[PDB]
Amino acid sequence: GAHLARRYLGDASVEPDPLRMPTFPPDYGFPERKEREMVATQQEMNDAQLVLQQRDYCAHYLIRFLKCKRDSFPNFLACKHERHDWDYCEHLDYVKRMKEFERERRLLQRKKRREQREAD
Amino acid sequence: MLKYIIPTIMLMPLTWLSKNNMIWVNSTAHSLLISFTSLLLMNQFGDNSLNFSLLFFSDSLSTPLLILTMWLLPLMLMASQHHLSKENLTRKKLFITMLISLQLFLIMTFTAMELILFYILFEATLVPTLIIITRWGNQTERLNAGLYFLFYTLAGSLPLLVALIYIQNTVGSLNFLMLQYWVQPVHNSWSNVFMWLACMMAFMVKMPLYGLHLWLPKAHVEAPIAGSMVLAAVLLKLGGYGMLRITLILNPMTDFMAYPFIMLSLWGMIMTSSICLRQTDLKSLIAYSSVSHMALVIVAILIQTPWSYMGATALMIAHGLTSSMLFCLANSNYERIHSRTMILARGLQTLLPLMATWWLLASLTNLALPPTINLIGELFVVMSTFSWSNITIILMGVNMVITALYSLYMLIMTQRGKYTYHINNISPSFTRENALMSLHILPLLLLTLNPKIILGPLY
Amino acid sequence: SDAPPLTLEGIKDRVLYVLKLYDKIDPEKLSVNSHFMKDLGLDSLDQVEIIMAMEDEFGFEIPDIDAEKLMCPQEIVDYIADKKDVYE
Amino acid sequence: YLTHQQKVLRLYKRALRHLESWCIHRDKYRYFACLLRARFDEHKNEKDMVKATQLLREAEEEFWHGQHPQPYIFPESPGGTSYERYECYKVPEWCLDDWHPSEKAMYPDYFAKREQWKKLRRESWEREVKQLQEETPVGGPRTEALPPARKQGDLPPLWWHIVTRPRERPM
Amino acid sequence: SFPKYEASRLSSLPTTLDPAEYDISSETRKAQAERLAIRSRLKREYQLQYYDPSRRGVIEDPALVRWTYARSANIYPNFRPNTKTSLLGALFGIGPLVFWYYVFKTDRDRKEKLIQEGKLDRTFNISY
Amino acid sequence: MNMFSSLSLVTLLLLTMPIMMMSFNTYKPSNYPLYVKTAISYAFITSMIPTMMFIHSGQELIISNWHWLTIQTLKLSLSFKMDYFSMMFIPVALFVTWSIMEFSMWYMYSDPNINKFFKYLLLFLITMLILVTANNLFQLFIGWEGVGIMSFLLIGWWYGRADANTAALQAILYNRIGDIGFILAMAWFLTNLNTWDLQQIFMLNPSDSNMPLIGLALAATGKSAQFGLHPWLPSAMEGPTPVSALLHSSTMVVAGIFLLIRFYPLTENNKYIQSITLCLGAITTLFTAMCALTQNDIKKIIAFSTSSQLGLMMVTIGINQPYLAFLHICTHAFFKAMLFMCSGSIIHSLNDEQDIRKMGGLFKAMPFTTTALIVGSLALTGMPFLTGFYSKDLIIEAANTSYTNAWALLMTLIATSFTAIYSTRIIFFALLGQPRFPTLVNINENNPLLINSIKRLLIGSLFAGYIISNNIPPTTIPQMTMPYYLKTTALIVTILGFILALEISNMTKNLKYHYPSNAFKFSTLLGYFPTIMHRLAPYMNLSMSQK
Amino acid sequence: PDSWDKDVYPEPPRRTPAPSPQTSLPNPITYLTKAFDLLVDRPVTLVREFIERQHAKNKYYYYHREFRRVPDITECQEKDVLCMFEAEMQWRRDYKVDQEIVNIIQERLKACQQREGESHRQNCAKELEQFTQVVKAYQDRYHDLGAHYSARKCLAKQKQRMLAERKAAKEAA
Amino acid sequence: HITKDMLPGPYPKTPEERAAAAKKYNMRVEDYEPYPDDGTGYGDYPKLPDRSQQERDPWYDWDHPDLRLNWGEPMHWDLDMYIRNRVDTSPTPVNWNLMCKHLFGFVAFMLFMFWVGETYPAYQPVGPKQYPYNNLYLERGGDPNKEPEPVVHYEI
Ligand SMILES: C[C@H](CCC(=O)O)[C@H]1CC[C@H]2[C@@H]3[C@H](O)C[C@@H]4C[C@H](O)CC[C@]4(C)[C@H]3C[C@H](O)[C@]12C
Numbered sequence A: 001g002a003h004l005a006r007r008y009l010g011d012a013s014v015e016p017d018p019l020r021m022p023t024f025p026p027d028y029g030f031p032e033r034k035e036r037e038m039v040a041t042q043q044e045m046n047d048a049q050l051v052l053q054q055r056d057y058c059a060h061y062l063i064r065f066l067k068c069k070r071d072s073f074p075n076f077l078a079c080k081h082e083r084h085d086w087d088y089c090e091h092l093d094y095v096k097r098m099k100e101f102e103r104e105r106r107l108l109q110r111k112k113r114r115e116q117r118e119a120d
Numbered sequence B: 001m002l003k004y005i006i007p008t009i010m011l012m013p014l015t016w017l018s019k020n021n022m023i024w025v026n027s028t029a030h031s032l033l034i035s036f037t038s039l040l041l042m043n044q045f046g047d048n049s050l051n052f053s054l055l056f057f058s059d060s061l062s063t064p065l066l067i068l069t070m071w072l073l074p075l076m077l078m079a080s081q082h083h084l085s086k087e088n089l090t091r092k093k094l095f096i097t098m099l100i101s102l103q104l105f106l107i108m109t110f111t112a113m114e115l116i117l118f119y120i121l122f123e124a125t126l127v128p129t130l131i132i133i134t135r136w137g138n139q140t141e142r143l144n145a146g147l148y149f150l151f152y153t154l155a156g157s158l159p160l161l162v163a164l165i166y167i168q169n170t171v172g173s174l175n176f177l178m179l180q181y182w183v184q185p186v187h188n189s190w191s192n193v194f195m196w197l198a199c200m201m202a203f204m205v206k207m208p209l210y211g212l213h214l215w216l217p218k219a220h221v222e223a224p225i226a227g228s229m230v231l232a233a234v235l236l237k238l239g240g241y242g243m244l245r246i247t248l249i250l251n252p253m254t255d256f257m258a259y260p261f262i263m264l265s266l267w268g269m270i271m272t273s274s275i276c277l278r279q280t281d282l283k284s285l286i287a288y289s290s291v292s293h294m295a296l297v298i299v300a301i302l303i304q305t306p307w308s309y310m311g312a313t314a315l316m317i318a319h320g321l322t323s324s325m326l327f328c329l330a331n332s333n334y335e336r337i338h339s340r341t342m343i344l345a346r347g348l349q350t351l352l353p354l355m356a357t358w359w360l361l362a363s364l365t366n367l368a369l370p371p372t373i374n375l376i377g378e379l380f381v382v383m384s385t386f387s388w389s390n391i392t393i394i395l396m397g398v399n400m401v402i403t404a405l406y407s408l409y410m411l412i413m414t415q416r417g418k419y420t421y422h423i424n425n426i427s428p429s430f431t432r433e434n435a436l437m438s439l440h441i442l443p444l445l446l447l448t449l450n451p452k453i454i455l456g457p458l459y
Numbered sequence C: 001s002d003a004p005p006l007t008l009e010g011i012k013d014r015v016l017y018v019l020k021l022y023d024k025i026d027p028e029k030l031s032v033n034s035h036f037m038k039d040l041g042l043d044s045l046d047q048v049e050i051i052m053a054m055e056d057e058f059g060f061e062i063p064d065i066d067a068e069k070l071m072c073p074q075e076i077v078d079y080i081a082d083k084k085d086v087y088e
Numbered sequence D: 001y002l003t004h005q006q007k008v009l010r011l012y013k014r015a016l017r018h019l020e021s022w023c024i025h026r027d028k029y030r031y032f033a034c035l036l037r038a039r040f041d042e043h044k045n046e047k048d049m050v051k052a053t054q055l056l057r058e059a060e061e062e063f064w065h066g067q068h069p070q071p072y073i074f075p076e077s078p079g080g081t082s083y084e085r086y087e088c089y090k091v092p093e094w095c096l097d098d099w100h101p102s103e104k105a106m107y108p109d110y111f112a113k114r115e116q117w118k119k120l121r122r123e124s125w126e127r128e129v130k131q132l133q134e135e136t137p138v139g140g141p142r143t144e145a146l147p148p149a150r151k152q153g154d155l156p157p158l159w160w161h162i163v164t165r166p167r168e169r170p171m
Numbered sequence E: 001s002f003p004k005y006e007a008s009r010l011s012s013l014p015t016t017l018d019p020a021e022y023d024i025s026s027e028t029r030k031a032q033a034e035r036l037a038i039r040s041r042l043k044r045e046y047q048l049q050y051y052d053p054s055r056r057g058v059i060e061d062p063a064l065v066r067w068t069y070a071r072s073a074n075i076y077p078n079f080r081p082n083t084k085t086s087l088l089g090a091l092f093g094i095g096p097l098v099f100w101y102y103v104f105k106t107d108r109d110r111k112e113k114l115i116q117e118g119k120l121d122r123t124f125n126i127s128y
Numbered sequence F: 001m002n003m004f005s006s007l008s009l010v011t012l013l014l015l016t017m018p019i020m021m022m023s024f025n026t027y028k029p030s031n032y033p034l035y036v037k038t039a040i041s042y043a044f045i046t047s048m049i050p051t052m053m054f055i056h057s058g059q060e061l062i063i064s065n066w067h068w069l070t071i072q073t074l075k076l077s078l079s080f081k082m083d084y085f086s087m088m089f090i091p092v093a094l095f096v097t098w099s100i101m102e103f104s105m106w107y108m109y110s111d112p113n114i115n116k117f118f119k120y121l122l123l124f125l126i127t128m129l130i131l132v133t134a135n136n137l138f139q140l141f142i143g144w145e146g147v148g149i150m151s152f153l154l155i156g157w158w159y160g161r162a163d164a165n166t167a168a169l170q171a172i173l174y175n176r177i178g179d180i181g182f183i184l185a186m187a188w189f190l191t192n193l194n195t196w197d198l199q200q201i202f203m204l205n206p207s208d209s210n211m212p213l214i215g216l217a218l219a220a221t222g223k224s225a226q227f228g229l230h231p232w233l234p235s236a237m238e239g240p241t242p243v244s245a246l247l248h249s250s251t252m253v254v255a256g257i258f259l260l261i262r263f264y265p266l267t268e269n270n271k272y273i274q275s276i277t278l279c280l281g282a283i284t285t286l287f288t289a290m291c292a293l294t295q296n297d298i299k300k301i302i303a304f305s306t307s308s309q310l311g312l313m314m315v316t317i318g319i320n321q322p323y324l325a326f327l328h329i330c331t332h333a334f335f336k337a338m339l340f341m342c343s344g345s346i347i348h349s350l351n352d353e354q355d356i357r358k359m360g361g362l363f364k365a366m367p368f369t370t371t372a373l374i375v376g377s378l379a380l381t382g383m384p385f386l387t388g389f390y391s392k393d394l395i396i397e398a399a400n401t402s403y404t405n406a407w408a409l410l411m412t413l414i415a416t417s418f419t420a421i422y423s424t425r426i427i428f429f430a431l432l433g434q435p436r437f438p439t440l441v442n443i444n445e446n447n448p449l450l451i452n453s454i455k456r457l458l459i460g461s462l463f464a465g466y467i468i469s470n471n472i473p474p475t476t477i478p479q480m481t482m483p484y485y486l487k488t489t490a491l492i493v494t495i496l497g498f499i500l501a502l503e504i505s506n507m508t509k510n511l512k513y514h515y516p517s518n519a520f521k522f523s524t525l526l527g528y529f530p531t532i533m534h535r536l537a538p539y540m541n542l543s544m545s546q547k
Numbered sequence G: 001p002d003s004w005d006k007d008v009y010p011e012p013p014r015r016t017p018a019p020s021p022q023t024s025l026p027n028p029i030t031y032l033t034k035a036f037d038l039l040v041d042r043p044v045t046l047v048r049e050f051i052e053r054q055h056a057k058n059k060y061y062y063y064h065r066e067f068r069r070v071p072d073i074t075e076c077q078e079k080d081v082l083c084m085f086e087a088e089m090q091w092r093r094d095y096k097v098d099q100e101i102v103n104i105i106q107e108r109l110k111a112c113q114q115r116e117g118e119s120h121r122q123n124c125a126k127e128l129e130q131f132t133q134v135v136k137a138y139q140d141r142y143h144d145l146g147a148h149y150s151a152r153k154c155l156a157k158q159k160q161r162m163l164a165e166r167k168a169a170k171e172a173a
Numbered sequence H: 001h002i003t004k005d006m007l008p009g010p011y012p013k014t015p016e017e018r019a020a021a022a023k024k025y026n027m028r029v030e031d032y033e034p035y036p037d038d039g040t041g042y043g044d045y046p047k048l049p050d051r052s053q054q055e056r057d058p059w060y061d062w063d064h065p066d067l068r069l070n071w072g073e074p075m076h077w078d079l080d081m082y083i084r085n086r087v088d089t090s091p092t093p094v095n096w097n098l099m100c101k102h103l104f105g106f107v108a109f110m111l112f113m114f115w116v117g118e119t120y121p122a123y124q125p126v127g128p129k130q131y132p133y134n135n136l137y138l139e140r141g142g143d144p145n146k147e148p149e150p151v152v153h154y155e156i
């Protein structure tokens, strides 16, 4: 774990705490942030019968996967392509998860230099 | 309740006037027949018990014990005739008569509407037992264990007589139905603390209670198979009956007086279970095993929880059916090797196939295999302790383990093993022997189909 | 396991054929009843090796006490025949 | 008892088996076996009783830390795979008596000869008692060895069960 | 090297390391022979009954009875005021009992007050 | 609906009809052994009709078909929980049982009590299915004991063998200990909660469920043979191989994990259970393999080889993977049970020989046996696209790519390679090298019946595990994104085990004397946990009882 | 189970989707389903009607006993079996009825949990919240009594509870 | 029908009494000695070796090879607990203390190391799996009456 190693073996403050993350203001110099829409409202998720963990922003794609699957019976190799639409959409979120962290990582690292000179 | 008392009495002329060779059959035929009528007593009612007259009455709790007793007389006779075949004609009638009276006292005991009458019959019930155990005993070693029964009267019966009398003078009556409405709050005093000991120590010894159990291991070591069955199937159950009824008037004093009793069992269960693994006798192993199960009941009664009473009722029932069968099963070997030693004969599954089927069958329910009533009650009680105290699960868990450890061991030591080379009289199982076990195991499971008949009165 | 039968006649060479590969014996001088120590001019320590081969040959241990006395091929056959209760 | 001379063998054969399992491979086994036998032949000619007595202590003190972690054991022998696995099926012979008539009617011929088998189990019994009273030392018999029958038609005493002992495979 | 195994109650020593048996003198020859003959006589005495057709029953072993007899030791041995075992032995049988006296009692005393103050959870508790 | 529910309940009652024919009547002897097998064969078909409907509809049906008992505010019934697990775990168990069914019809031809043999084999199957389908702890408890008891007889089939009597009670001793947590769990859900029906338990969503779950943790400690209560599972290999194939390889051993999965909604929030369960498998999953690296018993080795797979399953639950762990259950069972049967083929031709060092030269002398031995091993070792790899690659995803203890991931891979290590040590002696069996050759496996048994159970691992993946519907957000080495770390360390063991195996050919080593004995002697804890503890309980 | 009312047993409607198959293979389940009507259902219904018809020719009914209210324990006297008995049985029967209401309500929860399934948490606010109401009243009335429940004890507990809150209520003002 | 004198009795405090006891169970006077005189009260029974049955040779053709007990032999006071089924005291493969301490090492080693890893576990450096609708407050059944704190996880 490079991230695990660098945090504690390196300076602990720089790395945001994974459990408390996020920990800094959303508008810490980050203007005009477009909202993240939801295609499937509360009603659709409720009727979809999906695990809450299975429910997220990308889940609006996930609805498309099974819709073909139910009619696909008895065969199963008919809805393959639809899966990548949700999975790749899931793939984007994982990168976002990685990108979401860095904005918290950068501020802690950047703020160190500002405070270091404030008292050097 | 007369409809069962007189026909029970009528067996006495039948036991006597009958022909020479029909003495066994005649009592067996009707004795089985009477039990059929016994089933009628299951006409309970949701809110009220069954009050026939001022002399007898049976509630929901009473009936299941009544059925077992009446159901148990014919089974006792079946085993008896093998060892009595050599006895002369007159004595067999004598022994058989005692059982008929023994049943008579028991059936009247549990149905008694007045406590003193119950107290009177309670003392009477012992007299037939002592003759049966002593007159036809299996040993001549003169243990001189009279002090225990002297201790029973000194620490048991005799104090109970005074307390019962004292209650009547103060409360004004000893009819349990009256007690339901005239029960008064027994505040705390040294006198009451003495009164409390008078109402319970009498029944504790008979259960028995750990420490006070010294008579039971030596009572079965000498009592014949006919005597043994009633002792563990019925006589041990007398204490719970009175304790459940009598405790109606000891509150709130029981809220703290129970602890020395509770601790005796909670720890007593494990002690007995472990020693059984060391025992060197089929009957003695069952003896302490009997103390094990009876220890659970004591805890249930004292805490007096709605679940405790329900579970307690079955534990007496299942254990009575269980141990009674075990003695008969164990006494099946006695009919061949004429010994109680557990290691003298081994690997009997090689020569007694259907006998081992009972052994495996009985042992399975001895350790409270689900869903059998052996476990319904035992599992009922374990939960109740949790509300009273969460720590208790440690001892119940340990007790169930060891109770599961020795129960299979006895089966393992005898049936699952190599035959004794020198033994040369392992004859095939007789119809009587197998029949006796079957009558035990079968109904024991059947009640599991319908639990609503031995759930106690709280159901 | 279907049937692993055993026959004395078939077993005859199984005990003897074990001797047929020994490097301390002349095969032709050897006989069915020949005593190992005297007729075959062998020793107990040498005799130990022969007894061992029977356990790899047939697959069943041999007691130390009874292994020694089996100085005759017939006796070895008797031990194998008698222990497994083979009579024909 | 048993003398140290025979005690030599009790390690000669046993030590090989742990070595055998260690050897595993066949070419290794014979070669390593030759290594062990060669070591034995280092002292096999040693005829010194004090040394031969003293040339066994270390061997037993040497083998303990060489003993197999999971030594091999033969199937039928104690501790093996087939250790008494079929004892649960072997049936005593003496139980033949309690066979029900109808059951016995299936094998009329076999039971006919048994009556003669038991016949000599009864008639020969009496002389079998005396047959030991000439080979009976005072102070309790010295050993448990038994003699044969020194006549014709009888059998060595104390023989009934072994001769009638069940077979290895009941089924 | 080869540190000799420490003899323990649960680990009997190997047979070929006990110094007693390496040398077998009259002090061992005499004892060994006597037991065999004594054991042989028992076998001979038992051999009659085992191989006698007449017997129909179970041998009344004298060794077994004594072993069973000794187990049922009730009052014959032991003395009442024997301080070595009575006081300590009695503890193993009365000591731990009191220990449970406080264990459960403390919780119930502890438990009751919480209920009197509602410091314990019972909202969905009925079976009691 | 009606058709779906009605046809579903037939299996449990249908399987029991042959049993009802053993206690009654004497119409047709000599044909029961086939009678039972065809019932499972028929049962499988009726176990596949629900399969079609369930996948299409995902109709999790809880059927309460009786009012057994009623206490104040309680009610017990002989209900069943027709849901994902029953619809998907039943078909596999019958499939394996169907293979084992015909396997035992040949191996046990040497037993006059063969008919008795099946009188209990069908009994256990009934209890196990009732267990998984149980909607309530009590009824669930019944199966928890039926597997316990049905094992007792089947474990100790040859009651003469002292190993059976000692081992059978050893497991029963442990099996009972696990129930202590089980009975505790019922008490807590009865005191704090008020029922033993999973409907109320999950919906109420307990806020402090440490105690009830702690009992669940113990339940799997002994029943599934996790470390601390493990030793008995290998002990089962003192008896019939077919008996070990089903009970202790595919059906009974899965009980410990199953309960945690069946209580997935509660187990999620409390991480106290997860850590110890995660660590419990961690110590076991290697302690099994660490011991297994040098064990020298064909049947016991397989038991240890099974132990590690079971030990890891807890880690899979320990990482909060409810439905992904479930797959490892079915996937492992196929080949490992086949390996038992394959080990049966070896023992058959060997005529009662089991030492791994007394086997070899079987590649062509045992062609069919050699055929399926590699697939199970390769599938066991995690060969891509095979039955075992799917779980092995998938399971390692979250553990190595989600919040987990530092030391937990440590033994996670160390033993993972060891998984393949003993397989090579096995296939080496089993198949590589020239023959080493006794002089006489009893080798013969031209038995059509067994080939049917091997045929049925050879196919499933190759294809069925692949097929099972497709139909099952989504229930989780798969972690398809992760560092390439983490996604392939299994794809990296997998080949190491074969090579590393191959490095260990081949250097022993050279004619060089051997040298003792403590660790060589610590792992070989089972870490001394059994060799010690099965002497003093019996001595403590028993030697101290008299006082 | 002749005719059970649905008001006591609430049941949200079942909306089974109309299938919209789009694959190019025949539906397999259809083959079996039609056999169900002819080979299972009707034969399950054909014997039933033959059984049913006779029950129409032979008729007989039964009632549902109704216990009139009787004076409660507050209307009974100390040491008076007659009055006390009439209240005790009434108190016993009524309480025994109150036992089921917990089970009947429990049965509703078993409905809002399985039929709804994954929508358990948001679709059972009425059932889950109405579950608590039954727990509160039942628990207060007849809990902590002990094995020997009796109208005097329960009245004492109600007397215990009423007095307890009396001081607190006046404490506020 | 067994004599009184041939049954377990008091502790013999002199060699002359000890003569019978050794003879009584067919134990030569040398191999015989009872428990110390105390309140234990185990009688004139001998003090046999604390050994299991499996240690005795099975190759001998006993009367009872199952128990490896011969008729007439004495029995250990707890020979029932030392039977083949029960506790076995056969020679062990590895050193006693080290064997016990070999267990101690691995088990004691693992427990603490977990706690070491508990302080510093392993994970991935990524943010939360973001969710809409007030962090699924209502999906988790959160009370509709009292709205939760507004939650909006902005893009990036
Ligand atoms: C009713 C029928 C009796 C037929 C007869 O007269 O033999 C009973 C008695 C014997 C039974 C059969 C035997 O148990 C075995 C038959 C062959 C296979 O085992 C399948 C079940 C099998 C087909 C059974 C079907 C049915 O239960 C049978 C056929």
Ligand SMILES: *C(=O)CCCCCCCCCCCCC
Pocket: A001, A002, A004, F483, H122
């Ligand atoms: C810890 O779990 C993995 C150990 C390897 C850490 C990687 C260190 C070297 C590469 C870091 C830079 C690239 C990012 C993976």
